[PDB]
Design a protein around this ligand. Structure first.
Ligand SMILES: Nc1ncnc2c1ncn2[C@@H]1O[C@H](C[C@@H](N)CC[C@H](N)C(=O)O)[C@@H](O)[C@H]1O
Ligand SMILES: Nc1ncnc2c1ncn2[C@@H]1O[C@H](C[C@@H](N)CC[C@H](N)C(=O)O)[C@@H](O)[C@H]1O
Ligand SMILES: [Zn+2]
Ligand SMILES: [Zn+2]
Lengths: 183, 183
């Protein structure tokens, strides 16, 4: 009864609407649970930006491919999480750094899952935390938050406004259809 | 706060999505009530086919512009109503006639309002009733029935598949947003 790709009821399937975009930014999804939950919105990022990398998160045996990706000096990697959680010695930044393309590492799940991922992933500890400027959502007619909404604001912070606008529109489509599914 | 044109919550406003189409068929809406109610779907026809004529229905004082339109020999006028309610001497048909462009007269309101309009409008009595083949909605991945849904079937019956597809997509957008605004 539910689409296996877009996770909405079948009469509400949005797959035909999806128009991927392009961006200088790149996302990496560390997923606490890979089945796939409609309430987890990190997957919407991958619909709009299909170069999004996604992993199942592990407490003790992180993937070598994940380690390779976050250690690739081609990118500037950063952990996406509210600044108040970062240690006093943790580097916190407020814009993507200039030059190398950013790799936005999202902790995709619930808060206690996100928080657990933030604290028990030592391969992320030497990375800067970016504090997202959520007020930028106003320029996309979204409430100035879902993991997909955080990503929209990040894309806008990086000047990837085409992908921000495409993800906003895709997010609103999913959220509207989801609510309707509950009706 | 609701949009005054598309009658949805302001955050769910659909006006920007509307792309009118073109059709050989033409519609005429006799609306019981012209505030407008969100759940009256005759107005969705006008969004897709802006040459749709619309009048306020009156029992005793029909507009002369309405009388003039239905007496225009340029069109083949017909009243859109379930065939079971026609009189035995009423000409019932099952396809739009061939040759002159069809003028589909919709009774836009609720069922008791439509049935009242059907019975108390002497200017429509010498007109044929077209019985709508609603199984055609299957071709548009749709399935009582909204006035806008009946119009999609009529458009398809007349070969106006582009307008029928555009009205289907529009009706589903309205219906999905209306359900979500209800959530
Ligand atoms: N200020 C913020 N900075 C960074 N990420 C944020 C912020 N506020 C919310 N988030 C995101 O929201 C997640 C936690 C929950 N809100 C997730 C809700 C829901 N499961 C979703 O996927 O949208 C975090 O792991 C981040 O992805
Ligand atoms: N079998 C049918 N043949 C012709 N018109 C129909 C048929 N079934 C429904 N309709 C039309 O669709 C309306 C259905 C009503 N329930 C109105 C629902 C709602 N108020 C709307 O405006 O969409 C009728 O009043 C007619 O205008
Ligand atoms: Zn789907
Ligand atoms: Zn509107």
């Amino acid at each position: 009864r539910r689409c296996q790709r877009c996770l909405l009821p079948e009469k509400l399937c949005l797959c035909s609407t999806i128009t991927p975009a392009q961006a200088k930014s790149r996302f990496c999804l560390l997923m606490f649970d890979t089945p796939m939950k409609p309430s987890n919105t990190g997957r919407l990022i991958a619909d709009i930006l299909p170069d999004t990398v996604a992993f199942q998160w592990s407490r003790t045996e992180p993937s070598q491919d994940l380690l390779d990706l976050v250690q690739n000096p081609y990118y500037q990697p950063m952990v996406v999480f509210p600044a108040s959680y970062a240690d006093e010695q943790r580097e916190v930044i407020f814009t993507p750094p200039a030059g190398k393309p950013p790799l936005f590492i999202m902790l995709d799940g619930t808060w206690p899952e996100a928080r657990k991922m933030f604290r028990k992933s030592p391969y992320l500890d030497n990375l800067p935390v970016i504090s997202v400027d959520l007020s930028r959502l106003s320029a996309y007619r979204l409430r100035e938050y879902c993991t997909a909404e955080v990503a929209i604001a990040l894309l806008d912070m990086a000047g990837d406004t085409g992908a921000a606008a495409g993800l906003g529109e895709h997010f609103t489509r999913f959220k509207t259809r989801y609510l309707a599914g509950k009706t």
